[PDB]
Amino acid sequence: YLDELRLAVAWNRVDIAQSELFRGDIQWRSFHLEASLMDALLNDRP
Amino acid sequence: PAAVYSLVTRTWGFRAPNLVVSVLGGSGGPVLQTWLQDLLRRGLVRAA
Numbered sequence: 001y002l003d004e005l006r007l008a009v010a011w012n013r014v015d016i017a018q019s020e021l022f023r024g025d026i027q028w029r030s031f032h033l034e035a036s037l038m039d040a041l042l043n044d045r046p
Numbered sequence: 047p048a049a050v051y052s053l054v055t056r057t058w059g060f061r062a063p064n065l066v067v068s069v070l071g072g073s074g075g076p077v078l079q080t081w082l083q084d085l086l087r088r089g090l091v092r093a094a
Contacts, residue, residue, distance in 0.1 A: 026077075027077060
């Protein structure tokens with residue numbers, strides 16, 4: 001299932017994650033972060 | 047509460063305070079509108 005954070009990590013843009021995380025319009029869940037960290041570790045995005 | 051104040055000041059490493067504010071309210075748990083987030087994000091943390 002396509003979401004926003006995994007598409008941001010597939011790109012290299014940080015500001016999209018900045019705005020999506022710091023923006024208070026939608027409260028963030030846990031499954032999105034727990035899945036996307038796995039894709040962050042593999043492609044060497046420190 | 048004199049005992050618990052002496053506990054917090056003496057044993058644990060906390061310094062004695064200068065100002066005690068107390069947030070005391072209930073919104074019920076929806077997401078708040080944006081200028082309340084600006085208020086608690088600018089006024090009660092920078093001053094604190």
